[PDB]
């Protein structure tokens, strides 16, 4: 059989590399994505997506089917530190259900749970035949224009060529890739173990009523301090215990479980393994036609979900820069940005006790005592890492193409604000293709933009907006935004000279 040809050939079909193929199929390039496993999931590794990962999948057409798998609209979002779940709670912080839940101001996609078990389901039937379970990826060949790879699939055992015009590879954290091409990425904390415990326990919802939440945060022992979460929000929960030094034994899975809940309920374990987490950045996110994307790119802090959340965000951030590439209207140095984008993101963030006696006690003295607790925690910004959209919205590019000049902004790098413009259209709804040129009030000098990109063939779009609060909240008379939804350039008049922007926007300069 002669060598099958796409433009884009993703390795890894995993979370990453799947957000990639779907931001290619929503940018029509040609792809295909090789997964070695058979797509099926036995014990969920994510479910928490972050607001801005929503946004994409909004453009990427799955929002929708993401919030209706199957996390129940009332379902309590709370987390809460308990002695014992079901036991003397010692803080909680209220955070409502899906369907209570206060719209959000500044995004049309709050978070989302969706574990796995669901979410891949869901990503693979949006990506469709694109995607090919059961092949695995067994080496490749840089040429000038174009990556030759072998793969195997695994039922046949018989071996295809596919010849990409770029390579990449969302193969995960111990990245074969990256190794393959000689690209280094030293650690940059001591490996973290985590004992990962997937249980069910049928009634524990019911028996927990509204005082079930989301993440349990146990104080069981000065030695032993772990989350619990509910992991579909129907029955199956997730107990992650460190074993670090202070682990001295192994306790048996059950038996820790039961520990850790107060009730004398059904619970049945379905999973025991373990994670070793080893926070790594490459030293480089592409050699030649090869591209490094995801936790190949960068294995980060899981806390909130930043990992994976960091992982789509530079997901997106390819996806267009390969496309403009593709096209052809992308300057040479374009696909270069992607490295000094989004290697800072994950660089700036990873350079980012004992309990007191009694605190089990059913007496008033104990009750006392936990609230001190309550107090140590709040103070200490506990509750800050429920309610920080700066992590999610915050990150600002100061990059070579941007023109440089929490709360929503428009400044030159940041994501460009949301704004209802009907009651089912954001401003973030006009981005994700070309660039967009949003003009308040006067239109003068636009059409001078328009030529500008044309000579170029940089796709553009330009809208007149007039309503006076998004002028308010972009605050210049003309916002240029990237197609990546970030803001490229902005000012109350446009400059002088439209062919260097062109230039700078694209990576020509
Ligand atoms: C045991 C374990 C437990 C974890 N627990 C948590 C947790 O509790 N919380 C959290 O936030 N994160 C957890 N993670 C990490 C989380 O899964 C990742 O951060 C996340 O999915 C990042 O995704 P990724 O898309 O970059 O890569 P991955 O999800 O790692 O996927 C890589 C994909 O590459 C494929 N692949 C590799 N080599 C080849 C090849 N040669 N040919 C074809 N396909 C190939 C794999 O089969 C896989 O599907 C865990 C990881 C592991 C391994
Ligand atoms: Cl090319």
Same mark, same amino acid.
């Given at each position: 059989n002669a060598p099958i040809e796409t433009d884009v050939l993703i390795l890894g079909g995993g979370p990453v590399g799947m957000a990639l193929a779907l931001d290619l199929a929503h940018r029509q390039v040609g792809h295909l994505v090789v997964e070695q496993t058979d797509g099926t999931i036995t014990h969920p590794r994510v479910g928490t997506i972050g607001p801005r990962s929503m946004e994409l999948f909004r453009r990427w057409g799955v929002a929708k089917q993401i919030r209706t798998a199957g996390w129940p609209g009332d379902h309590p979002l709370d987390a809460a530190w308990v002695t014992r779940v079901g036991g003397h709670e010692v803080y909680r912080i209220p955070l409502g259900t899906?369907?209570?839940?206060? =719209?959000?101001?500044? =995004?049309?996609?709050?978070?989302? /749970?969706?574990?796995?078990?669901?979410?891949?389901?869901?990503?693979?039937?949006? #990506?469709?035949?694109?995607?090919? &379970?059961?092949?695995?990826?067994? !080496?490749?060949?840089?040429?000038?224009?174009?990556?030759?790879?072998?793969? =195997?699939?695994?039922? &046949?055992?018989? $071996?295809?060529?596919?010849?990409?015009?770029?390579?990449?590879?969302?193969?995960?954290? !111990?990245?074969? &890739?990256?190794?393959?091409?000689? /690209?280094?990425?030293?650690?940059?904390?001591?490996?973290? #173990? *985590?004992?990962? /415990?997937? *249980?069910?326990?049928?009634?524990?919802?019911?028996?927990?009523?509204?005082?079930?939440?989301? *993440?349990?945060?146990? @104080?069981?022992? !000065?030695?032993?301090? +772990?989350?619990?979460?509910?992991?579909?929000?129907?029955?199956?929960?997730?107990?992650? #215990?460190?074993?670090?030094?202070?682990?001295? !034994?192994? @306790?048996?899975? +059950?038996?820790?479980?039961?520990?850790?809940?107060?009730?004398? $309920?059904? /619970?049945?374990?379905?999973?025991?393994?373990?994670?070793?987490? &080893?926070?790594?950045?490459?030293?480089? *996110?592409?050699?030649?036609?090869? +591209?490094?994307?995801?936790?190949?790119?960068?294995?980060?802090?899981?806390?909130?979900?930043?990992?994976?959340n960091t992982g789509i965000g530079s997901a997106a951030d390819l996806g267009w820069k390969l496309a403009a590439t593709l096209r052809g209207w992308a300057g040479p140095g374009l696909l270069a940005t992607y490295e000094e984008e989004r290697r800072p993101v994950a660089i700036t963030s990873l350079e980012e006790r004992e309990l007191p006696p009694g605190l089990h006690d059913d007496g008033p003295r104990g009750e006392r005592i936990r609230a001190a607790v309550a107090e140590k925690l709040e103070r200490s910004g506990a509750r800050r890492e429920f309610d920080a959209p700066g992590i999610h919205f915050g990150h600002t590019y100061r990059s070579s193409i941007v023109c440089g000049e929490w709360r929503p902004s428009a400044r030159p790098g940041a994501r460009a604000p949301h704004a209802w413009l009907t009651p089912t259209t954001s401003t973030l709804d006009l981005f994700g293709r070309g660039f967009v040129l949003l003009s308040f009030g006067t239109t003068d000098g636009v059409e001078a933009v328009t030529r500008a990109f044309a000579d170029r063939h940089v796709p553009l779009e330009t809208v007149t907006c007039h309503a006076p609060e998004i002028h308010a909240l972009y605050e210049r008379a003309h916002v240029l935004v990237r197609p990546d939804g970030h803001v490229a350039w902005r000012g109350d008049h446009l400059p002088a000279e439209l062919g260097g922007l062109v230039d700078k926007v694209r990576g020509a300069a």
């Open positions: 899906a369907d209570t839940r206060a =719209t959000p101001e500044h =995004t049309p996609e709050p978070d989302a /749970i969706c574990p796995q078990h669901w979410l891949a389901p869901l990503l693979a039937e949006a #990506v469709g035949e694109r995607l090919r &379970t059961r092949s695995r990826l067994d !080496s490749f060949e840089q040429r000038d224009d174009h990556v030759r790879a072998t793969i =195997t699939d695994l039922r &046949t055992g018989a $071996t295809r060529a596919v010849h990409a015009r770029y390579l990449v590879a969302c193969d995960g954290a !111990s990245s074969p &890739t990256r190794k393959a091409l000689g /690209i280094d990425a030293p650690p940059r904390h001591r490996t973290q #173990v *985590f004992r990962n /415990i997937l *249980f069910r326990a049928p009634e524990l919802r019911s028996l927990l009523g509204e005082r079930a939440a989301l *993440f349990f945060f146990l @104080m069981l022992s !000065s030695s032993l301090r +772990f989350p619990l979460r509910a992991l579909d929000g129907r029955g199956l929960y997730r107990l992650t #215990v460190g074993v670090d030094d202070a682990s001295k !034994s192994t @306790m048996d899975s +059950f038996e820790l479980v039961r520990r850790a809940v107060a009730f004398d $309920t059904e /619970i049945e374990v379905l999973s025991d393994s373990e994670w070793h987490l &080893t926070h790594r950045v490459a030293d480089s *996110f592409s050699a030649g036609r090869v +591209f490094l994307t995801g936790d190949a790119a960068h294995t980060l802090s899981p806390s909130g979900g930043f990992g994976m």
